[PDB]
């Protein structure tokens, strides 16, 4: 609802395009439109300057499961 | 060749991967001044990449259909450099470390409070025992022969 870009004519385009109002009212909405959709950047980061974040993503899942 | 594999010096996929990596590096190189530090770093990376591919090609490795090197560990004498010789080196070093540790523990156990010498190392004593790992395979073998390596089952207890 806030962050995004604006054109010369003044048309605001949001990063996720105003999907919070309709999709955040079910658990399936949080699972599909928030975690699954937005995890793409972190899981596609290998081979670029952001690959350290993918490595830490996996390592932190490992430590969490280790605590059990 | 072995298991349907192809030598990496004759693989088209291997050369394709090399060319793709070099092109990806050159695209970044074309963003900076020729004499700037980032350009020199990228050029050094490119030279290192070419050297790596050439050495992999001429060291006799085998490449699969994906175009990546694969290792052979069944005992074939054309690939001992892949597993057997480094394995001998690993065993030699590990035996040295274990042997010097055991000898320190045995030499220190005769004191009044041996535990005090386990949280505070006697460096003077350890510096006489460290060089003796150089011949651990002989010492361990002779100790095994004379029955000094192992404790009898009847004597084991707290």
């Amino acid at each position: 609802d806030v962050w995004g870009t604006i054109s010369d004519q003044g048309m605001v385009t949001h990063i996720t395009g105003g999907n919070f109002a309709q999709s955040s009212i079910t658990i399936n909405g949080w699972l599909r439109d928030f975690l699954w959709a937005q995890a793409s950047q972190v899981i596609q980061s290998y081979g670029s300057s952001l690959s350290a974040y993918g490595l830490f993503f996996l390592g932190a899942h490992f430590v969490w499961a280790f605590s059990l | 060749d072995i298991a349907g594999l192809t030598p990496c010096k004759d693989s088209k996929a291997f050369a394709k991967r090399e060319k793709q990596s070099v092109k990806k590096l050159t695209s970044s190189l074309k963003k900076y001044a020729p004499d700037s530090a980032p350009a020199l770093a990228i050029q050094a990376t490119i030279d290192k990449t070419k050297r790596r591919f050439e050495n992999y090609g001429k060291f006799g490795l085998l490449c699969g259909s994906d175009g990546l090197p694969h290792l052979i560990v069944s005992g074939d004498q054309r690939h001992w450099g892949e597993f057997i010789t480094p394995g001998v080196l690993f065993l030699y070093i590990a035996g040295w470390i274990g042997w010097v540790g055991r000898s320190y523990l045995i030499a220190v156990s005769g004191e009044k409070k041996p535990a005090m010498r386990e949280i505070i190392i006697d460096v003077e004593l350890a510096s006489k025992i460290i060089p003796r790992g150089f011949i651990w395979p002989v010492a361990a073998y002779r100790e095994w022969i004379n029955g000094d390596l192992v404790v009898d089952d009847a004597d084991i207890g707290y």
Binding site: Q22, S23, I27, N28, G29, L31, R32, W36, A39, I43, Q44, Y46, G47, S48, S51, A52, G54, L55, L58 | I2, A3, G4, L5, F14, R17, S21, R52, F53, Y56, G64, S65, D66, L68, P69, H70, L71, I72, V73, S74
Partner: protein, 733 residues
């Protein structure tokens, strides 16, 4: 006998809610009941086994009746590749109209469920053709289920109760069960195949009203009696045969072809008939080994007493094991459960590579479901085997009568056994996790050519020995001029070799470095689970920390905070810890199976071959990629037929997590809280006119461990089942 439970005075005098819970949990532990004797134990067990048979027959009859009443078996028979079979109709008053529209499928006139158990293919392969046949089968099974209850009631009356010495006649029982239950049943099923199912696979309909007149073979039993048996094989089915019809049909009944039927992609029926005939012969011979009443037969005790190595390295050998086994029912249950678990895994492995039911190989979702289902059942059985084996050491083992035999020496070198198992687990874990992490780092820095990729040379060599030509090895059955190739060249080698070298089926799939890595991970799982269970069993009677453990029984909370603290010290707790590792290992197995097959069925093997060598590949290309349809079963724009599965998916994640609550927080926190609520209720007007009669208390320590593990397991299973079924059926149906 005062109140519920009537079988335990100690529980019946308990004034708290703990009376009820525990009353349910100890109902089937007959050995612990008040004033129980040895004979009544066996008799009650016999009655209970009859009950289990009755329930099983009812379950099967219900399946048949519902399929006949509400299914489309007749329609499916005529177009088996494009029609979806129907399990049962849906009548839910909570449904909305869009769901009513979405769940109407398969040509039905109302909402239905699609069946994935595979009963349509099974029942079509054995010769059933109409709904009347299904109705008659359901009624017959209803009769058998009643027979079981009547027999159970009869053998529980004073005139008809077997004595204790009857239940301990080992030789006679072994003879009857080997000869009659295995061999004769196989003979009867072979007869069914010859008289009913094989003719049905050629257009001939044989039923109970005309089976006497029709001959299974034109020349009858003449060749069997005279010995010209080869006449039963000489005219097999053609390679252009259509399964339900007479086009290309043959006349043979017993063959040795091998390979598959080109249309149905399953095993030839004549091969199955000859197989069951030979197996029946082998069991009929096996069932004559032991002595009952006729002066011939071996003696089991005398067999055990004789096999003793003369060097003394095995002590006194197998002396005394006959009574040790025959006087302990837990020992027997452990042996049986171990054997059944092994063969459950063998069934799962052999049914995916060598299908036996017509048109089931093309039904991808059904095959996935069957493999996963039977592997999870096998895992649970394997854990139970070690559980009852540990129970043996506490309850029934007698040291004096086992002096210096193999069973005692096992207890004698437990430190060596456990330490070497620990070493194996450490080695596998360190080096396998290290290789995966090295490959992940190489991928991250953009240098995939620096990975460590070990070719699975030994497995490829064995595949070559079995006939595969992919890897260029020339050995045994993969060579042209050898004794092994020559000996079978004319019997079964052509069809077998044609099947193995076809790369569309799942017979000896091509393997690479990813397969190497995942197999060493599976080995890690097996070794660690075995370590946990074995340590539980061998330390059951005591250790240095608790030298008198056997006095306290199989399951008890702890021994208090003294001597450093003693949480989770009983054998029951070792079982509890091992179940987690079992679930982990079976998860790895089923993940690997599913991903390899899903890339096979899409024609994209290189995806698996390249992504499987590092763990981010597993996370991204298997889990994340294959969820997209599943999580859109319902959304802000509408719903489709996957909605139930989507719902189930979330249901699973919930139950799993709820289990964590019982596993992490322990009892003393909850009891203090409960006291306050009791105070509050006793003080509230208009509500203190109502009184409880069982005083509420927090759950016990062992009970909490059990409840937490149960929520964990249920959530595990439901989540994976939803993902597997939705992902496969969304792509293929």
């Amino acid at each position: 006998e005062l109140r519920f439970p009537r079988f335990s005075q100690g529980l019946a005098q308990d004034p708290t809610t703990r009376r009820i819970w525990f009353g349910i949990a100890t109902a089937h532990d007959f050995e612990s009941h008040d004033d129980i004797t040895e004979e009544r134990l066996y008799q009650n067990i016999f009655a209970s086994h009859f009950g289990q048979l009755a329930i099983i027959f009812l379950w099967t009859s219900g399946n048949l009746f519902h399929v006949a009443w509400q299914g489309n078996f007749e329609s499916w028979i005529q177009d088996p590749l494009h029609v979806r079979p129907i399990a049962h109709a849906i009548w839910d008053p909570h449904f909305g109209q869009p769901a009513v529209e979405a769940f109407t499928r398969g040509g039905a006139a109302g909402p239905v469920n699609i069946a994935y158990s595979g009963v349509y293919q099974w029942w079509y392969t054995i010769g059933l053709r109409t709904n009347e046949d299904l109705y008659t089968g359901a009624l017959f099974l209803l009769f058998l289920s009643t027979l079981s209850l009547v027999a159970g009631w009869l053998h529980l009356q004073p005139k008809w109760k077997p004595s204790l010495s009857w239940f301990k006649n080992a030789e006679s029982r072994l003879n009857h069960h080997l000869s009659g239950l295995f061999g004769v049943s196989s003979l009867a099923w072979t007869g069914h195949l010859v008289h009913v199912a094989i003719p049905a696979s050629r257009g001939e309909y044989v039923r109970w009203n005309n089976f006497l007149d029709v001959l299974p073979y034109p020349q009858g039993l003449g060749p069997l009696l005279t010995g010209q048996w080869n006449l039963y094989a000489q005219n097999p089915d053609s390679s252009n045969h259509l399964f339900g019809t007479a086009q290309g049909a043959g006349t043979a009944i017993l063959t040795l072809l091998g390979g598959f039927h080109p249309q149905t992609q399953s095993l030839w029926l004549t091969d199955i008939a000859h197989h069951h005939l030979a197996i029946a012969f082998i069991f009929l011979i096996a069932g004559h080994m032991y002595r009952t009443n006729f002066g011939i037969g071996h003696s089991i005790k005398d067999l055990l007493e004789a096999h003793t190595p003369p060097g003394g390295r095995l002590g006194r050998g197998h002396k005394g094991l006959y009574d040790t086994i025959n006087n302990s029912i837990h020992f027997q249950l452990g042996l049986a459960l171990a054997s059944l678990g092994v063969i459950t895994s063998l069934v799962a492995q052999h049914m995916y590579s060598l299908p036996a039911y017509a048109f089931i190989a093309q039904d991808f979702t059904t095959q996935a479901a069957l493999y996963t289902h039977h592997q999870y059942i096998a895992g649970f059985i394997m854990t139970g085997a070690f559980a009852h084996g540990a129970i043996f050491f506490i309850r029934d083992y007698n040291p004096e009568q086992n002096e210096d035999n193999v069973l005692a020496r096992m207890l004698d070198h437990k430190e060596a056994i456990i330490s070497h198992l620990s070493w194996a687990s450490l080695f596998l874990g360190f080096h396998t996790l290290g290789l995966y992490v090295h490959n992940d780092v190489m991928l991250a820095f953009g240098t995939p050519e620096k990975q460590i990729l070990i070719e699975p040379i030994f497995a490829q060599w064995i595949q070559s020995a079995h006939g595969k030509t992919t890897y260029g090895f020339d050995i045994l059955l993969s060579s042209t001029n050898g004794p092994a190739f020559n000996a079978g060249r004319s019997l079964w080698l052509p069809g077998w070799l044609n099947a193995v070298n076809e790369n569309s089926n799942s017979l000896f799939l091509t393997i690479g470095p990813g397969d190497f890595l995942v197999h060493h991970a599976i080995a890690l799982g097996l070794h660690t689970t075995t370590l946990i269970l074995v340590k539980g069993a061998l330390d059951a009677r005591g250790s240095k920390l608790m030298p008198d453990k056997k006095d306290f029984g199989y399951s008890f909370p702890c021994d208090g905070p003294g001597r450093g603290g003693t949480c989770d010290i009983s054998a029951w707790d070792a079982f509890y810890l091992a179940v987690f590792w079992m679930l982990n290992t079976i998860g790895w197995v089923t993940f690997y199976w599913h991903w390899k097959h899903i890339t096979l069925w899409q024609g994209n093997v290189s995806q698996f071959n390249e992504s499987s060598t590092y763990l981010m590949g597993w996370l991204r290309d298997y889990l994340w990629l294959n969820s997209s349809q599943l999580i859109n079963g319902y959304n802000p724009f509408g719903m489709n037929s996957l909605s139930v599965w989507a719902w189930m998916f979330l249901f699973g994640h919930l139950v799993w997590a709820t289990g964590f609550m019982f596993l992490i927080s322990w009892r003393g926190y909850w009891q203090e809280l409960i006291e306050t609520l009791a105070w509050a209720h006793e003080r509230t007007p208009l509500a203190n006119l109502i009184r409880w009669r069982d005083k509420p208390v927090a759950l016990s320590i062992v009970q909490a461990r059990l409840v937490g593990l149960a929520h964990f397991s249920v959530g595990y299973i439901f989540t994976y089942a939803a993902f597997l079924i939705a992902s496969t059926s969304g792509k293929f149906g």
